[PDB]
Amino acid sequence: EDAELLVTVRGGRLRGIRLKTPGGPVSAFLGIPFAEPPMGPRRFLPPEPKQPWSGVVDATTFQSVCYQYVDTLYPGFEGTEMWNPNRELSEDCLYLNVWTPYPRPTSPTPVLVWIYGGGFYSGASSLDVYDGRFLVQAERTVLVSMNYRVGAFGFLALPGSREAPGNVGLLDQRLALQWVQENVAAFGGDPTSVTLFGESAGAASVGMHLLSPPSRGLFHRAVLQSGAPNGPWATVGMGEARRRATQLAHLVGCPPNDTELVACLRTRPAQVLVNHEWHVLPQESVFRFSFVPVVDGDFLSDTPEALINAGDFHGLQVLVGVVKDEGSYFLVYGAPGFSKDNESLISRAEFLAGVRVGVPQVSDLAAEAVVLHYTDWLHPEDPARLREALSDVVGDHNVVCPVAQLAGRLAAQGARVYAYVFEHRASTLSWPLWMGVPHGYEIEFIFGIPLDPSRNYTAEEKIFAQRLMRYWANFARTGDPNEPRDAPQWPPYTAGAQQYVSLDLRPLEVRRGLRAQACAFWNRFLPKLLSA
Amino acid sequence: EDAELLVTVRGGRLRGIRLKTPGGPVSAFLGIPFAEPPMGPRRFLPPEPKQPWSGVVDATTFQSVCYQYVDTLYPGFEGTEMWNPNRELSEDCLYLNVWTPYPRPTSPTPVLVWIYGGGFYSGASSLDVYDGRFLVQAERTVLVSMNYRVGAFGFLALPGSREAPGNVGLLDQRLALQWVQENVAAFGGDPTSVTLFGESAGAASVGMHLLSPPSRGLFHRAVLQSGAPNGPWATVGMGEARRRATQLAHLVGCPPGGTGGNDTELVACLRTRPAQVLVNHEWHVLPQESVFRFSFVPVVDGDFLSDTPEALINAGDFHGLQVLVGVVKDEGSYFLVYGAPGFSKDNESLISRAEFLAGVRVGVPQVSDLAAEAVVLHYTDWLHPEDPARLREALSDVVGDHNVVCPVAQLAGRLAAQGARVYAYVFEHRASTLSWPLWMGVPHGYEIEFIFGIPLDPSRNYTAEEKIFAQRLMRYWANFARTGDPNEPPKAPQWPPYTAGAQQYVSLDLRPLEVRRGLRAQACAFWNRFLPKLLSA
Ligand SMILES: *[C@@H]1O[C@H](CO[C@@H]2O[C@@H](C)[C@@H](O)[C@@H](O)[C@@H]2O)[C@@H](O[C@@H]2O[C@H](CO)[C@@H](O)[C@H](O)[C@H]2NC(C)=O)[C@H](O)[C@H]1NC(C)=O
Numbered sequence A: 001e002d003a004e005l006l007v008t009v010r011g012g013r014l015r016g017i018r019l020k021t022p023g024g025p026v027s028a029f030l031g032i033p034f035a036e037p038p039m040g041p042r043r044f045l046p047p048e049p050k051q052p053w054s055g056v057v058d059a060t061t062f063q064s065v066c067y068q069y070v071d072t073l074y075p076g077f078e079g080t081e082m083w084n085p086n087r088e089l090s091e092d093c094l095y096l097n098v099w100t101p102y103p104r105p106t107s108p109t110p111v112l113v114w115i116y117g118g119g120f121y122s123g124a125s126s127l128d129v130y131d132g133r134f135l136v137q138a139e140r141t142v143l144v145s146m147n148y149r150v151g152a153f154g155f156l157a158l159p160g161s162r163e164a165p166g167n168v169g170l171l172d173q174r175l176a177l178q179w180v181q182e183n184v185a186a187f188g189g190d191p192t193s194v195t196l197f198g199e200s201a202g203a204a205s206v207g208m209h210l211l212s213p214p215s216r217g218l219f220h221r222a223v224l225q226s227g228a229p230n231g232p233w234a235t236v237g238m239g240e241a242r243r244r245a246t247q248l249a250h251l252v253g254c255p256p257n258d259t260e261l262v263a264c265l266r267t268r269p270a271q272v273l274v275n276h277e278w279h280v281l282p283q284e285s286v287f288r289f290s291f292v293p294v295v296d297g298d299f300l301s302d303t304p305e306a307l308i309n310a311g312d313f314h315g316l317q318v319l320v321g322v323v324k325d326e327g328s329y330f331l332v333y334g335a336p337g338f339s340k341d342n343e344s345l346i347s348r349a350e351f352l353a354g355v356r357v358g359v360p361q362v363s364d365l366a367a368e369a370v371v372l373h374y375t376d377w378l379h380p381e382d383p384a385r386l387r388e389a390l391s392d393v394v395g396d397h398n399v400v401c402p403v404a405q406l407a408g409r410l411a412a413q414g415a416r417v418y419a420y421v422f423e424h425r426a427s428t429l430s431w432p433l434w435m436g437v438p439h440g441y442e443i444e445f446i447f448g449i450p451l452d453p454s455r456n457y458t459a460e461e462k463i464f465a466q467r468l469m470r471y472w473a474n475f476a477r478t479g480d481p482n483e484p485r486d487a488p489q490w491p492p493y494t495a496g497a498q499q500y501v502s503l504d505l506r507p508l509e510v511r512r513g514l515r516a517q518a519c520a521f522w523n524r525f526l527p528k529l530l531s532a
Numbered sequence B: 001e002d003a004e005l006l007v008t009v010r011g012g013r014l015r016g017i018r019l020k021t022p023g024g025p026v027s028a029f030l031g032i033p034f035a036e037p038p039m040g041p042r043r044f045l046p047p048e049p050k051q052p053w054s055g056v057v058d059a060t061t062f063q064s065v066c067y068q069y070v071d072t073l074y075p076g077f078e079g080t081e082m083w084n085p086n087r088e089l090s091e092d093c094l095y096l097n098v099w100t101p102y103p104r105p106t107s108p109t110p111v112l113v114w115i116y117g118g119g120f121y122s123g124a125s126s127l128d129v130y131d132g133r134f135l136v137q138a139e140r141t142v143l144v145s146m147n148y149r150v151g152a153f154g155f156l157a158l159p160g161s162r163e164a165p166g167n168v169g170l171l172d173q174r175l176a177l178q179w180v181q182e183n184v185a186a187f188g189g190d191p192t193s194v195t196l197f198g199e200s201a202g203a204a205s206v207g208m209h210l211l212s213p214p215s216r217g218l219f220h221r222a223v224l225q226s227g228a229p230n231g232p233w234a235t236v237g238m239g240e241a242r243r244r245a246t247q248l249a250h251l252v253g254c255p256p257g258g259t260g261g262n263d264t265e266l267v268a269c270l271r272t273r274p275a276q277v278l279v280n281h282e283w284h285v286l287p288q289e290s291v292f293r294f295s296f297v298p299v300v301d302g303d304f305l306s307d308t309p310e311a312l313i314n315a316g317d318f319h320g321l322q323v324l325v326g327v328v329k330d331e332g333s334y335f336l337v338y339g340a341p342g343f344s345k346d347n348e349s350l351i352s353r354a355e356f357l358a359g360v361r362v363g364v365p366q367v368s369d370l371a372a373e374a375v376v377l378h379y380t381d382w383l384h385p386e387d388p389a390r391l392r393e394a395l396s397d398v399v400g401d402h403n404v405v406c407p408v409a410q411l412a413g414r415l416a417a418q419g420a421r422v423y424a425y426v427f428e429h430r431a432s433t434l435s436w437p438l439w440m441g442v443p444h445g446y447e448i449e450f451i452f453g454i455p456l457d458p459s460r461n462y463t464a465e466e467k468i469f470a471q472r473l474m475r476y477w478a479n480f481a482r483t484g485d486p487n488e489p490p491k492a493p494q495w496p497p498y499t500a501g502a503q504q505y506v507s508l509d510l511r512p513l514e515v516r517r518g519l520r521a522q523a524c525a526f527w528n529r530f531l532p533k534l535l536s537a
């Protein structure tokens, strides 16, 4: 028996597993229960803390994926399958994982806490691309990741109701953060040095914890990769959340009053709610998800935009960034003329129809403004430019401009902010060349996946992954990603100078402006238009 | 008596003068009466044709400048005084001018008819910069210019009234064009080949004649320099014109103890005021402090213009028409010193962000806060939002694009798509003699002297290159007048037609023609396609 793999936490005893990496071993505790199973009468309810157990929990393998939609766009294709559930689905899914150096650290080690993305409707901490073994070995941090409920199970809301208050997936995440406060020291982690990091909806989640006082006391620093709590897809108002929940109930034959509606929903098999969840959206769109965090005054006391404007962010350091081509991946899910299997050289008519798919639920006047700004009026009908332009529309509106607005406001209100654009397209990418560096494709580099010999990355890619892991861990340790002067240095982003760095195989290059002209449109003008 | 200097026109006999030009002699008939003097009871009324006379009228010097405002921004300064009246002011001003080769052409010669600009409130055919002698000598065309009423006298309108129906200054121009049809042959001119040209409000006027069927039959080609009839300053609606006329009447005491009332009585009272008294108040009836807005301009009242120029252009079939159109490099700069905060010809006008924002409201007057925010969005560099030189240039672009470039671009694109052959230019040479500061670039009005061949005047101190440049331009303009195509009937760089898709235009400067694409296409998409939709909602 190996004592390094036996840990006692508040609820009881656990047995972990020793993992190999090319750099040496790591200890892992996978599938640690942190809540009571949120099922039966507990579906839609806030998570309850896991009650203490006798005996030893086997923490040697990932637990179930929270019940969710499974993508079917391209069955068996690596680029989509890599995001799909890779363990069995269950509502019994509130488990978390801890990776630590081997042997266990005996002094307090900085903690990275990963929150997966997936539009709040999908994702799992067990995905291969989130394997924490390389970051932990290389950079000697403790890494924690949790599953949280998604889709209707995590975000269905009848606002005001006790039976389905909404935001329970964010409470699962908060409960995991509390568990980290109470137990991470037993693994060698320092609960006073916790850095949250997340991508996409995971990044939106990180932002929401920043903006919610009861979460804010549970961590110290934040990293938001390709996502922000102020993204137009990341929250829904109370009225529309009620509308969607009510429609879902109808679609699944409920009722046979909030209490009655929820009671009926609780009788339905999980897969039945999943089968209808896309259909409660108000229109056909890309980058919109039915069940997302609701602004109801509780978890979020106001919209993230308002909270961001009102906040004093002295004492916060935050690392934020985007990939080179944020919009491209979403276009194959509904923009007319798009496919991963051709060049997607669309026509002007397709472009104009695509603007309403990618900028859903705005007035005709707003759409015309989008078309004005994203048309090259010297080449209004050129298909390659139209393809790139619609990618820009979707990527700017949903990711780049919300991230830029968060970055500028936080910096202006006291935070120290570092910004990047990730510009390396992986040698192993399975999506077509036209998509460039798509959403999600920096993650495997941050997690050091190229170091895995069984995969096919180049030697240059391994060095690049090592560089990125070092920036991320430097940031978690000190609030500053920089290595000692040599360089160039990564300067802080500020509302005026707007400096960020390119992350690519080449050394850091400093640039100015996160699509400043386009983001002035989305961040400054378009809301005034929508308001009048 | 010299037979070359004697001509009989329908009204009677004329005597003209022989003018010397650096290239040789020209015949000039200056100050030919073409209407009855529009004064006393004829003030505000359409022009009446000139009654025939016995004996010989001496057409031997320019007649009076139509009564108008006189600029006082920079007293004595060449750059402003060159546009000010250079003959006595009078309401008795409806005379035109004919220049013809000496000896008179023996076969019918193409005619150019010049219409001056000046915002419909100013201008005169007598200004030195419109001297027709060089063009006639160099290119052997006949040149005609006319005075037309301006300000209140030409454009005060009480729509529906017979006593001040509006647009009478446009009717003055039209009567002159009819005179050309009836009489130009007596001077050796070909009435079947008349090309109108004009700059600024004169260019807007040309376009209004294009769009008004009774004028359209009086000429065959058109040139629009730095102006268009669809310009936002160029026309006013019936209600706003009535409001302006009524407020002007009120400011000078008409009617006594009241506002508005019976139109006959209102106008009768206005007709008793001294001309200068109307002039002293004409700027005060505008709805706000602005630049590039003028109180009394053509009114869209269903008569001269049956619909807005914008709509007439969109609806028109322009097959059979050739047009030449263009802009100078810095259309906006000249207007800024007339009211944009922080601007002066006497410093660098390096304005602050706050002055830029205030200037946007002065330069894009009478739009919603939302429309103004859209302008600020499109004209701010969000990487350099407070940089004074960029702000100075951006406000110049705002004013020039909104008032001149984008209206010309829209007219050019619509006419081309609807049948016309169109040629477009940007004029990019700053005159060696220009007296405005360097920051203003090539300002509004500063191509005219080259088109008229003014650098060929010895008493002026233009360079030899500039004389050669002037000769080139006169050649393009007269080629266009003769053939509907400015290109030379070889190994010379060719000027391609402008079309809605390719949007090709040429750069006019000392260097040879360079072909470029797009008349500020991104900016003009904003002004022409989007901003109107915004204003409607
Ligand atoms: C590029 O492909 C899209 C998507 O099409 C699918 O994938 C192709 C590789 C091929 O297998 C097609 O038959 C598939 O339909 C094409 O857009 C579609 O066009 C078809 C008609 O040809 C229409 O029935 C679908 O509804 C369209 N789908 C969408 C999402 O618009 C597009 O035409 C292709 N571009 C080309 C060929 O230039």
Ligand SMILES: *[C@@H]1O[C@H](CO[C@@H]2O[C@@H](C)[C@@H](O)[C@@H](O)[C@@H]2O)[C@@H](O[C@@H]2O[C@H](CO)[C@@H](O)[C@H](O)[C@H]2NC(C)=O)[C@H](O)[C@H]1NC(C)=O
Pocket: B339, B340, B341, B342, B343, B344, B346, B347, B348, B349, B350
């Ligand atoms: C640039 O000049 C403008 C215009 O001012 C006039 O011209 C100057 C050259 C000088 O002769 C001034 O005395 C003239 O008033 C300046 O704008 C003005 O500022 C004064 C007070 O400083 C104010 O009373 C006027 O209203 C302003 N005029 C405007 C706003 O049109 C401007 O400040 C000058 N820029 C400098 C000096 O950097």
Ligand SMILES: Cc1cccc2c3c(ccc12)C1=C(C(=O)C3=O)[C@@H](C)CO1
Pocket: A071, A119, A278, A284, A285, A286, A287, A288, A330, A333, A334
């Ligand atoms: C089934 C369905 C309907 C409408 C939109 C969908 C979408 C996805 C998957 C299934 C969808 C989908 C994305 C979308 O933007 C999207 O709109 C990406 C987040 C990848 O999976």
Ligand SMILES: Cc1cccc2c3c(ccc12)C1=C(C(=O)C3=O)[C@@H](C)CO1
Pocket: B071, B118, B119, B283, B289, B290, B291, B292, B293, B334, B335, B338, B339
């Ligand atoms: C007296 C007065 C008030 C308001 C605006 C005026 C303006 C000019 C002259 C006098 C003005 C004036 C121009 C304007 O744009 C302008 O707004 C240019 C056309 C040159 O003369």
Ligand SMILES: *[C@@H]1O[C@H](CO)[C@@H](O)[C@H](O)[C@H]1NC(C)=O
Pocket: B262, B263, B264, B265
């Ligand atoms: C206006 O007053 C004059 C003054 O006599 C009169 O002749 C005219 O008919 C009046 N018109 C109207 C419409 O009242």
